[PDB]
């Protein structure tokens, strides 16, 4: 399942589910992301 | 010294120390300083 | 107390009406950096020449 | 005017200035009277600029430190912006200019005489006017460039462009609230009002300044551009106009008072009611929307 | 119904302005000194007079601040007298307890 | 549950410069004066310049050092106000008691 | 103060007499300074009109934040009842 994890984008109920679970918006969760992968051009994620 | 300025040049014109300096609210403060502006523009277009 | 704001207050109208003023030294600064300017033109002529 | 009245009166208590405090800033009444200490001013404007060539200097530019030499604890910049504020409002029941003024001096006026020309009525309430201007500098606490970048364009904090800058209770608290922002920003504040100056603020660096993420910022911006506004918010102004810096700004405390992001926000405004007339929202789009 | 004193009001003070004005320039005499002599003498007299200028400042400043420095004693001297009162008062209160 | 007011905020001062800068430099003039004469005339002219300087100097830091004491006598004389409503409030207090 | 000894008319005085120096007189000047300083910041522009005969009601309305409909109401209704000092518009605000 792709997870759009753009800063600037509205997602997959995936993506909420992410949010709740870590409590964060979707900018702070980009910049997470950005944390776990500085090679993810786009905002991909495998969900595995 | 402005009326021998005066008389140094034809010019009975000059009007180079004007009142006032002293001011009456105030101590007068700042009259001595004032004058000494006067003296020295008088220096420079007689100089000049 | 009360006693204490009568006395602030009036120490307060000192500061308002002693000869020595805010207004006194805005003024006094004022025209002695007017003053200062001119003169700091002249005197830079006279170096120059 | 319900909501004018309120946001005022809550400001003002905020702030623990009564109205008549801000009644003596707003309004354009000037008693007109002889006080002494207008009669000071005079005096030092007048044996200050005794001598005066229009092709030498500016007339308002060497006047500058001689009126703020009459007015409590205003410096030079101050008073020259307090000039021309003064100029583009034209004070007086005769509209009056800083070259009315002095021709009215050089030209009518005498020195420790009490008795003078009517015409020094219209004048008086020049010189209370300043006075108020200067409060205004003072009571708002803007940045003294701030303050003058406001009189010499009140263009980039929303004005008509064609108009003197705004003297009214809405403006005035504009200005302390923009005084207020730049404090926020601190240490980064000159910076920031520098890159104001010509468009060089933009978000990122706005960013820097109040510690937010940069795609927030941006992200708020977009926003704001993609909704229409009352100012609108475009590319172009989004950062070199005050309001739609405030408009952004706006967004951000809203989507951070939710806990969410700027996306978030869009999807709730789209759930009015009224706009949504056009196109029905899904049930399904009001479940991703709780979500 | 319980009396209830309302707020304390604040004090205001007056700021007032004293306004003299000049006429008031004298009328100039001709000097049988040369110029640059008199312009020499003048310059004499005006460092005269902004000495005695600066001076005088100083006099009034200094005077400025002792009567400040009076008003202080004065006015700290007369709120002892009430806090010797108030202690006069607790150990009062000590005997009645 | 117990509501808790959390932390009370620090406040921040805005650090503002200002730039001005001169062309400056005035069209030189050709004095009919040998070179000593006009080499001590602008020494003492400087003189005078420098003197203005510390008189100008002591004069601003001087206004500065009126204002700080301006701001002091009025911002105690507002807390004087709400200690007063203290005092009130406490002699209410005793009434109760 | 130098109004006061000066025109001691201006504040009730005979005015062919010498300015008051009497325990009445003295609280009469200091209700006077308390009732300036009540004027606070206006003061200056207050005396000034005081100093003419440019002192008005509607004025005086704009220094002490009262109404100014209540000022010159209060000056119609001084002047149509009797007085020990009798109040005419001539010297309702002239006279202190």
Same mark, same amino acid.
């Given at each position: 399942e792709e997870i759009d994890l753009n800063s600037g984008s509205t997602g997959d109920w995936r993506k909420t589910i992410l949010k709740r679970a870590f409590n964060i918006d979707d900018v702070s969760l980009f910049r997470l992301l950005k944390i776990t992968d500085h090679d993810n051009k786009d905002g991909k994620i495998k969900n595995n | 010294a402005e009326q021998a300025y005066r008389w140094e040049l034809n010019d009975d014109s000059a009007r180079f120390i004007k009142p006032g300096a002293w001011q009456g609210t105030y101590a007068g403060l700042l009259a001595g300083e004032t004058l000494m502006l006067s003296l020295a523009q008088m220096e420079d277009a007689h100089l000049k | 107390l009360k006693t204490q704001q009568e006395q602030t207050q009036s120490q307060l109208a000192f500061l308002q009406r002693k000869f020595s003023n805010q207004a006194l030294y805005n003024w006094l600064r004022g025209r002695l950096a007017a003053i200062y300017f001119q003169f700091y033109d002249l005197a830079v002529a006279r170096c120059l020449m | 005017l319900i909501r004018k009245l309120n946001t005022i009166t809550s400001w003002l208590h905020t702030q623990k200035w009564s109205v008549f405090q801000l009644f003596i800033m707003t309004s354009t009444s000037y008693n007109k009277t002889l006080t002494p200490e207008i009669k000071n001013l005079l005096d030092t404007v007048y044996?200050?600029?005794?001598?005066?060539?229009?092709?030498?200097?500016?007339?308002?530019?060497?006047?500058?430190?001689?009126?703020?030499? %009459?007015?409590?604890?205003?410096?030079?910049?101050?008073?020259?912006?307090?000039?021309?504020?003064?100029?583009?409002?034209?004070?007086?029941?005769?509209?009056?200019?800083?070259?009315?003024?002095?021709?009215?001096?050089? %030209?009518?006026?005498?020195?420790?005489?009490?008795?003078?020309?009517? %015409?020094?009525?219209?004048?008086?309430?020049?010189?209370?006017?300043?006075?108020?201007?200067?409060?205004?500098?003072?009571? %708002?606490?803007?940045?003294?460039?701030?303050?003058?970048?406001?009189?010499?364009?009140?263009?980039?904090?929303?004005?008509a462009t064609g108009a003197a800058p705004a003297h009214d209770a809405l403006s005035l608290i504009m200005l302390t609230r923009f005084a207020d922002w730049v404090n926020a920003l601190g240490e980064k504040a000159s910076s920031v009002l520098a890159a104001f100056e010509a468009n060089s603020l933009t978000a990122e660096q706005l960013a820097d300044a109040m510690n937010l993420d940069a795609n927030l910022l941006l992200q708020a911006s977009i926003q704001a551009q993609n909704h229409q506004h009352l100012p609108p918010v475009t590319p172009e102004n989004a950062f070199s106009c005050w309001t739609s810096i405030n408009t952004i700004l706006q967004w951000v405390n809203v989507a951070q008072q939710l806990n969410v992001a700027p996306q978030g926000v869009s999807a709730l405004v789209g759930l009015d009611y009224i706009q949504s007339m056009k196109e029905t929202p899904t049930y399904a789009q009001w479940e991703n929307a709780a979500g | 119904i319980y009396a209830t004193p309302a707020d304390p009001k604040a004090l205001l003070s007056a700021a007032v302005a004293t306004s003299q004005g000049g006429g008031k320039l004298p009328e100039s005499f001709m000097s049988l000194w040369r110029f640059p002599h008199m312009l020499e003498n003048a310059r004499g007299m005006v460092s005269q007079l902004t000495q005695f200028g600066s001076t005088l400042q100083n006099i009034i400043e200094r005077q400025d601040a002792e009567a400040l420095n009076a008003l202080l004693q004065n006015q700290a001297a007369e709120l002892i007298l009430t806090n010797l009162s108030i202690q006069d008062k607790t150990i009062e209160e000590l005997d009645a307890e």
């Open positions: - | - | - | 044996h200050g600029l005794q001598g005066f060539d229009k092709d030498k200097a500016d007339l308002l530019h060497v006047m500058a430190p001689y009126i703020a030499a %009459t007015l409590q604890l205003s410096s030079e910049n101050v008073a020259h912006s307090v000039l021309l504020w003064a100029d583009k409002l034209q004070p007086g029941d005769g509209a009056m200019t800083a070259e009315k003024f002095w021709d009215w001096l050089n %030209t009518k006026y005498t020195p420790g005489s009490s008795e003078a020309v009517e %015409t020094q009525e219209h004048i008086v309430q020049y010189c209370q006017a300043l006075a108020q201007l200067e409060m205004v500098y003072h009571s %708002t606490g803007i940045n003294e460039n701030a303050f003058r970048l406001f009189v010499t364009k009140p263009e980039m904090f929303g004005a | -």
